[PDB]
């Protein structure tokens, strides 16, 4: 036959269209869209039975185990994360390369990426992956440093196709001053990079944690109390101000604060290039889940939580992340942000640590280490939730089907297409473009069917995650659709609950410059950077 | 000083669609009932006062090229995709002509 | 405070005077330091009737971190002191001065350029946020930035105890007076300025203050 694969009787969903049509696939790519394709033309034919076909999900906020152990030991390798991704309808992930402070000179940042690429090149990869670069050591003073940093970003792009840089305004060891952020912005704007910020006020967080410990308030729930929404709001406001002074496009990761969303919206209204990301957990969970006792998940339906296991005082740690899962009444704000344009993309902030084994370096119970003066205090709890698998189905269900998102188009926009565009993987990834797109596609189950599908899951379980972690925070909850087929580069890698390892051929992805991150050329004063 | 905030509105999502408000009255003939000079009618107490000027400009032809040029090419719109969204696809969606009109969808779209 | 009182006790004084206390060295970490700082403010009040404390968010040698401001606020709230802040972002000021010097833009006029209104606005917003977390009344000194006045007004509308000071020069002068070339002063009527003495390159310094005299 002329084509490897034909998808028939399905409904195509893109970031701006919904329509019935059929797709032909060959040599790893979308070849053709037409009303009807002769089935004798394909080696393999899939009857979608009226279900939606979406592009594969792109999760640009995934954490995997890496050799510098920035977040300590993490349970998932790139092998495990991409397997989990594919089981949940995600076909590209972007993880993080830790700046290696031991490497010096022009190649120092390229050498940081090399560590990751080399390590993952031996693992079985179920889908493609890219890398962001994390920066926490910036040379001073700014002017004398400019050449080296600029040269270093060029080498990282030229050699490994890295075009994004991530910085933190909180966390000891990661928090960098406003001064250093401006130095970085200088270099990134010049190189058309995508600039990412974690915006929480680190000083406020540090002070308040010490105040709480002084009163003995150390349980997992006080993680949220140590850093309320006003802290994320302040730092987001500060970071916008920096980006404005420096005419540098900026993306805020995992936004959870209404005050942050508010200053973000105001900047977007002004036309400033300010982008934002949020995560399912900020729309679906509230902080009540961190201790025993309508637009989110019914919290009492979650299994293995402080509600069902009130004896286990440490179980709240399953839901500890940064920024914290917010108080009741905040979650609706996050949905509105997804609908009204505040949030450009949705990622998972996938970050996995075991709960049901206590001894290993990748356990949540790592917070118990009597010799290192660690006795379970929230300060020592490894922050993060597994989420790479659940991201797409959670939005399909609680977003589209339950009506918290406006449409399937909006779902595709924020889950697939915008992530590709903002991180320079477009048009190779993110859409369904004949002759252009890698054939990365998801075929769902039909929503309005009376037909029984034995393979369609009713609940989220750990086994369904296909990951290396021993829990998921969404364990036990109803889920009303799931990927029936996940196609990766024209091959079926997930079919009806089964992973097909023999079709796993994922590769490291060299990314381009994002067309969304060219500068506005707008300034606060008459000052201009030398190079202009 | 007002015109810039209209461009920002087109980019930031304030404006869903762009139309012309096409409404045409002659200027170089003065006698017809479809003339701007209809404002001069001494026998009906009309002597050219702004109150009596028929309101409107011709614009149906110039709408698309003006945005292509002053919007996309000159950089006042973010991209060609924003151009299509507000000029083509959103109008179809908001007025119930979608998907017959507004896009390029095989087997579905009128070939417009 | 004693150093100041003792010195002025020998001068001829034409009217009464009081003193604010300026703080730029705060002990760390916060919790262990709390008792001493509290005791010290008590002693300053009991002995000399000082009930106000001033801190800076800019100037090398005076700029203190958000962390240290919270420590101070903890003490001042407890003692019913008046807490005063100079709110400009010191990091943004420092970076921009260096950027201007690198291009050789060093004339008095570039003092304003190094620290536009948005810099005072950011820091004032940051300081309100701290005051809110700490439930501590706060006064902003010499406010000159529209963005600063905006966030101050919003806090006052909420009923937070945020007070503010401004100065005649921020209502009456614009930065045109700092170099060669209205509801305030007709600037051309000022004598001995860059307008009347364009030969004198340094005369703009007569009107250099912090925060800077703002644009028209
Ligand atoms: N914050 C969190 O939930 N996990 C650590 C991953 C990160 O945000 O860098
Ligand atoms: N900034 C200024 O005008 N003078 C120095 C006194 C001060 O503001 O502390
Ligand atoms: Zn983070
Ligand atoms: Zn993260
Ligand atoms: Zn009309
Ligand atoms: Zn001052």
A17 and A140 in a single domain? The answer is: no
Does residue A123 lie within any of the structural domains? yes
DSSP per residue over A149-180, as a string? Answer: HHHHHHHHHHHH---EEEEESSSTTTB--HHH
Pairing of strands A250-252, A274-278: parallel
State the Rg of chain B over Cα. 19
Give kind and range of the element (H or E) at residue A275: strand A274-278
Tell me how far apart the alpha carbons of residues A379 and A158 are, in angstroms, rounded to a whole number.
39
Subunits next to C (3 or more Cβ pairs <8 Å) are A
Residue A189: strand, helix, or coil: helix
Tell me how far apart the alpha carbons of residues A440 and B17 are, in angstroms, rounded to a whole number.
32
At residue C80, φ and ψ (nearest 5 deg) are: 60, 30
Residue A23: strand, helix, or coil: strand
- With beta carbons less than 8 A apart as the criterion, state whether B86 and B17 touch: yes
A293 and A441 in a single domain? The answer is: no
- CATH number of the domain encompassing residue A173: 3.20.20.140
Q: What's the angle, vertex CA A117, arms to CA A116 and CA A120, rounded to 5?
A: 85
Q: Give the residue from C31, C94, C99, C148 with the most A CB atoms within 10 Å of its CB, the best one to mutate.
A: C99
Task: State whether the beta carbon of C210 lies less than 6 angstroms from ligand 2.
Answer: yes
- With beta carbons less than 8 A apart as the criterion, state whether A325 and A274 touch: no
A233 interface with C at CB cutoff 8 Å? yes
A220 backbone φψ class: left, alpha, beta (φ>0; ψ -120 to 50): alpha
Give C141 Cα–ligand 6 centroid separation in angstroms: 7
- With beta carbons less than 8 A apart as the criterion, state whether B15 and B8 touch: no
Residue ranges of the alpha helices (H) in A395-493? 408-412, 418-422
Chain A 168-197, residues with CB within 8 Å of chain C CB atoms: 177-179, 182-183
B49 backbone φψ class: left, alpha, beta (φ>0; ψ -120 to 50): beta
Q: What's the angle, vertex CA A347, arms to CA A345 and CA A348, rounded to 5?
A: 160
Residue A326 DSSP label: P
Please state the separation of Cα A488 from the chain's center in Å.
19
- With beta carbons less than 8 A apart as the criterion, state whether A55 and A409 touch: no
State the Rg of chain A over Cα. 23
Does residue A519 lie within any of the structural domains? no
Does residue A530 lie within any of the structural domains? no
Indicate the length of chain B as a whole number.
Answer: 112
Residue ranges of the alpha helices (H) in A380-513? 391-394, 408-412, 418-422
DSSP bridge pairs for A488: A491
C104 interface with A at CB cutoff 8 Å? no
Task: State whether the beta carbon of A196 lies less than 6 angstroms from ligand 1.
Answer: no
Tell me how far apart the alpha carbons of residues A491 and A91 are, in angstroms, rounded to a whole number.
12
- With beta carbons less than 8 A apart as the criterion, state whether A15 and A416 touch: yes
Tokens coding A216: 């003995």
C30 interface with A at CB cutoff 8 Å? yes
A137 and A10 in a single domain? The answer is: no
A440 and A365 in a single domain? The answer is: no
Residue A418: strand, helix, or coil: helix
DSSP per residue over B58-110, as a string? Answer: --TTTHHHHIIIIIIITTSSS-HHHHHIIIIIHHHHHTT-TTTSSS--TTTS-
- With beta carbons less than 8 A apart as the criterion, state whether C187 and C179 touch: no
Give A348 Cα–ligand 1 centroid separation in angstroms: 10
Tell me the torsion sign for CA atoms A285, A289, A295, A296: positive
Residue B47: strand, helix, or coil: strand
**Full domain range(s) for residue A43:** 1-55+428-445+481-501
Tell me how far apart the alpha carbons of residues C76 and C139 are, in angstroms, rounded to a whole number.
12
The 3-state secondary structure of A202-260, one letter per residue: HHHHHHHHHHHHHCCCCCCCHHHHCCCHHHHHHHHHHHHHHHHHCCCCEEECCCCCHHH
A299 and A227 in a single domain? The answer is: yes
Tokens coding A182: 């401006």
Tell me which residue in A18, A35, A340 faces B107 most closely, judged by beta carbons: A35
- With beta carbons less than 8 A apart as the criterion, state whether A219 and A291 touch: yes
State the Rg of chain C over Cα. 20
Tell me how far apart the alpha carbons of residues C84 and C128 are, in angstroms, rounded to a whole number.
12
A-chain residue closest to B105, CA distance: A19
Tell me which residue in C92, C113, C130 faces A527 most closely, judged by beta carbons: C113
A370 and A455 in a single domain? The answer is: yes
Does residue A507 lie within any of the structural domains? no
Tell me how far apart the alpha carbons of residues A267 and A277 are, in angstroms, rounded to a whole number.
15
In this structure, how many other beta carbons lie within 10 angstroms of the beta carbon of residue C27? 12
A30 and A116 in a single domain? The answer is: no
Q: Could you give the angle at which helices C30-48 and A202-214 cross, rounded to 10 degrees?
A: 90
Closest CA to C85 of C24, C127, C40: C127
| Omega cis (within 30) before A104 | no
DSSP per residue over A506-529, as a string? Answer: --B------TT-S-----SSS---
Task: State whether the beta carbon of C62 lies less than 6 angstroms from ligand 2.
Answer: no
Residue owning tokens 């977040």: A71
Does residue A512 lie within any of the structural domains? no
A440 and A455 in a single domain? The answer is: no
Contacts of A515 in chain B (CB under 8 A): 79
Question: Which of C63, C142, C210 has most ligand 2 atoms within 8 Å of CB, for mutation?
Answer: C210
Tell me how far apart the alpha carbons of residues A291 and A272 are, in angstroms, rounded to a whole number.
40
Whole-Å CA distances, A139 to A177, A199, C91: 12, 21, 15
Ligand 1: atom nearest CA of A168 is 9
Nearby residues of A54 by Cβ (< 8 Å), 6 or more positions away: A13, A89, A408, A411, A412, A415, A416, A441, A442, A444
Residue A399 DSSP label: I
Tell me how far apart the alpha carbons of residues A13 and A432 are, in angstroms, rounded to a whole number.
9
A36 and A107 in a single domain? The answer is: no
Nearby residues of A227 by Cβ (< 8 Å), 6 or more positions away: A200, A204, A205, A208, A323, A324
Q: Do residue C91 and residue A178 have CB atoms under 8 angstroms apart?
A: yes
Tell me how far apart the alpha carbons of residues A143 and A146 are, in angstroms, rounded to a whole number.
5
Please state the separation of Cα A211 from the chain's center in Å.
32
A136 and A188 in a single domain? The answer is: yes
Q: Do residue A18 and residue B99 have CB atoms under 8 angstroms apart?
A: yes
- With beta carbons less than 8 A apart as the criterion, state whether A67 and A469 touch: no
Count A/C contacts: CB-CB distance under 8 Å. Answer: 87
- Consult the annotation and say whether C210 binds a ligand: yes
Tell me how far apart the alpha carbons of residues A130 and A110 are, in angstroms, rounded to a whole number.
14
Tokens coding C198: 């364009």
Considering only CA atoms, which residue is closest to atom 8 of ligand 1? A322
Tokens coding C172: 């009456």
Residue owning tokens 């001068």: C11
Q: What's the angle, vertex CA A348, arms to CA A347 and CA A353, rounded to 5?
A: 155
- CATH number of the domain encompassing residue A435: 2.30.40.10
B23 backbone φψ class: left, alpha, beta (φ>0; ψ -120 to 50): beta
Protein residues within 5 Å, CB atom, of ion ligand 5: B 21
Whole-Å CA distances, B29 to A143, A379, B3, B57: 67, 82, 31, 16
Residue B57: strand, helix, or coil: strand
Q: What's the angle, vertex CA A24, arms to CA A21 and CA A28, rounded to 5?
A: 135
Tell me how far apart the alpha carbons of residues C216 and C203 are, in angstroms, rounded to a whole number.
19
Nearby residues of A38 by Cβ (< 8 Å), 6 or more positions away: none
Tokens coding A374: 């660690």
Task: State whether the beta carbon of A352 lies less than 6 angstroms from ligand 1.
Answer: no
Tokens coding A148: 């080296």
- With beta carbons less than 8 A apart as the criterion, state whether A272 and A239 touch: no
Tokens coding A241: 């101000």
Whole-Å CA distances, C51 to A29, C16, C46, C83, C132: 74, 17, 9, 9, 21
- With beta carbons less than 8 A apart as the criterion, state whether A42 and A3 touch: yes
Residue A435: strand, helix, or coil: coil
Count of structural domains within chain A: 2
Q: Mark A210-235 as b/e (b = at least 16 C-beta within 10 Å).
A: bbbbeeeebbbbbbbbbbbbbbbbbb
- With beta carbons less than 8 A apart as the criterion, state whether A127 and A438 touch: no
Tokens coding A87: 């089981």
Q: Do residue B85 and residue A16 have CB atoms under 8 angstroms apart?
A: yes
In this structure, how many other beta carbons lie within 10 angstroms of the beta carbon of residue B90? 18
Does residue A523 lie within any of the structural domains? no
Ligand 2: atom nearest CA of C62 is 9
Tokens coding B52: 């009596």
Give kind and range of the element (H or E) at residue A46: strand A42-47
Indicate contact of C with B: 3+ CB pairs under 8 A: no
Residue A267 DSSP label: H
Residue A280: strand, helix, or coil: helix
DSSP per residue over chain C, as a string? Answer: -HHHHHHHTTS--SS----PEE-----SSHHHHHHHHHHHHHHHHHHH---EEEEESSSTTTB--HHHHHHHHHHHHHTTPEEEEE---HHHHHHHHHHHHHTT--STTHHHHTS-HHHHHHHHHHHHHHHHHTT--EEE-S---HHHHHHHHHHHHHT--EEE---HHHHH--GGGGS----S--GGG-SSSTTT-TT-TTGGGGG--SSPPPP-
Does residue A131 lie within any of the structural domains? yes
Tell me how far apart the alpha carbons of residues A496 and A49 are, in angstroms, rounded to a whole number.
14
Indicate contact of A with B: 3+ CB pairs under 8 A: yes
At residue C52, φ and ψ (nearest 5 deg) are: -135, 145
A39 and A102 in a single domain? The answer is: no
Contacts of A53 in chain B (CB under 8 A): none
Q: What's the angle, vertex CA A331, arms to CA A459 and CA A211, rounded to 5?
A: 110
Please state the separation of Cα A18 from the chain's center in Å.
25
Pairing of strands A57-59, A90-98: parallel
Tell me how far apart the alpha carbons of residues C74 and A105 are, in angstroms, rounded to a whole number.
45
Task: State whether the beta carbon of A200 lies less than 6 angstroms from ligand 1.
Answer: no
DSSP per residue over A91-151, as a string? Answer: EEEEEEEEP-TT--STTHHHHHHHHHHHHHTTS--SSEEEEEEE-----SSHHHHHHHHHH
Closest CA to A97 of A188, A189, A171, A162: A162
Considering only CA atoms, which residue is closest to atom 9 of ligand 2? C210
Nearby residues of A235 by Cβ (< 8 Å), 6 or more positions away: A169, A170, A199, A200, A201, A202
Does residue A474 lie within any of the structural domains? yes
Please state the separation of Cα C145 from the chain's center in Å.
12
How many Cα atoms are found within 13 Å in the side-chain-facing hemisphere of A408?
15
Q: Do residue A21 and residue B107 have CB atoms under 8 angstroms apart?
A: yes
A311 and A406 in a single domain? The answer is: yes
């Amino acid at each position: 036959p002329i084509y490897d694969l034909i998808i028939k009787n399905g409904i195509i969903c893109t970031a701006s269209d919904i329509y019935a049509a059929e797709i032909a696939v060959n040599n790893g790519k979308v070849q053709l869209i037409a009303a009807s394709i002769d089935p004798s033309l394909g080696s393999e034919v899939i009857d979608a039975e009226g279900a939606f076909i979406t592009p594969g999900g792109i999760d640009a906020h995934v954490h995997v185990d890496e050799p510098l152990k920035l977040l300590g030991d993490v349970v998932d390798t790139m092998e495990h994360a991409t397997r989990s991704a594919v089981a949940g309808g995600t076909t590209t992930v972007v993880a993080f390369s830790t700046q290696d402070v031991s490497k010096k000179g022009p190649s120092a940042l390229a050498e940081s990426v090399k560590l990751d690429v080399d390590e993952y090149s031996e693992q079985t990869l179920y889908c493609d992956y890219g890398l962001h670069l994390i920066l926490f050591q910036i040379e001073k003073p700014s002017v004398e440093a400019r050449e080296l940093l600029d040269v270093q970003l060029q080498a990282a792009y030229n050699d490994y196709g890295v075009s994004s840089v991530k910085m933190f305004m909180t966390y000891p060891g990661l928090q960098i001053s406003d001064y250093d952020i401006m130095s970085a912005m200088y270099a990134t704007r010049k190189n058309g990079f995508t600039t990412m910020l974690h915006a929480e006020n680190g000083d406020m967080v540090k002070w308040m944690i010490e105040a709480l410990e002084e009163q003995g308030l150390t349980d997992a729930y006080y993680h949220g109390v140590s850093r309320p929404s006003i802290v994320e709001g302040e730092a987001t406001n500060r970071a916008i101000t920096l980006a404005t002074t420096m005419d540098t496009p900026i993306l805020f990761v995992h936004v959870s604060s209404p005050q942050a969303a508010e200053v973000i919206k105001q900047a977007q209204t002004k036309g400033l290039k300010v982008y934002a990301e949020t995560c399912p957990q900020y729309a679906l969970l509230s902080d009540a889940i961190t201790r025993c006792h309508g637009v989110g998940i019914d919290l009492s339906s979650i299994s293995e939580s402080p509600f069902t296991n009130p004896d286990d005082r440490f179980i709240g740690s399953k839901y500890i992340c940064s920024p914290p899962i917010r108080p009741e009444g905040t979650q609706k704000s996050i949905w509105k942000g997804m609908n009204n344009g505040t949030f450009t993309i949705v990622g998972s902030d996938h970050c996995s640590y075991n709960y049901y084994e206590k001894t290993s370096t990748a356990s949540k119970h790592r917070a118990f280490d009597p010799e290192n003066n660690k006795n379970g205090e929230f300060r020592y709890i490894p922050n993060g939730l597994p989420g790479v698998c659940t991201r797409m189905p959670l939005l399909y269900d609680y977003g589209y089907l339950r009506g918290n998102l406006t449409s399937m188009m909006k779902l595709v926009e924020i889950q697939c297409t915008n992530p590709a565009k903002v991180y320079g993987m477009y048009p190779q990834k993110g859409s369904i473009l004949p002759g252009v797109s890698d054939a990365d596609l998801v075929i769902w189950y039909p929503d309005d069917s009376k037909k029984e599908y034995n393979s369609k899951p009713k609940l989220i379980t750990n086994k369904l995650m296909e990951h290396n972690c021993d829990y998921t925070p969404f364990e036990g909850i109803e889920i009303k659709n799931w990927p029936r087929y996940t196609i990766v580069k024209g091959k079926i890698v997930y079919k009806e609950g089964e992973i097909l390892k023999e079709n796993a051929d994922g590769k490291y992805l060299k990314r381009g410059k994002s067309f969304m991150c060219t500068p506005k050329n707008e300034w606060v004063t008459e000052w201009r950077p030398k190079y202009e």
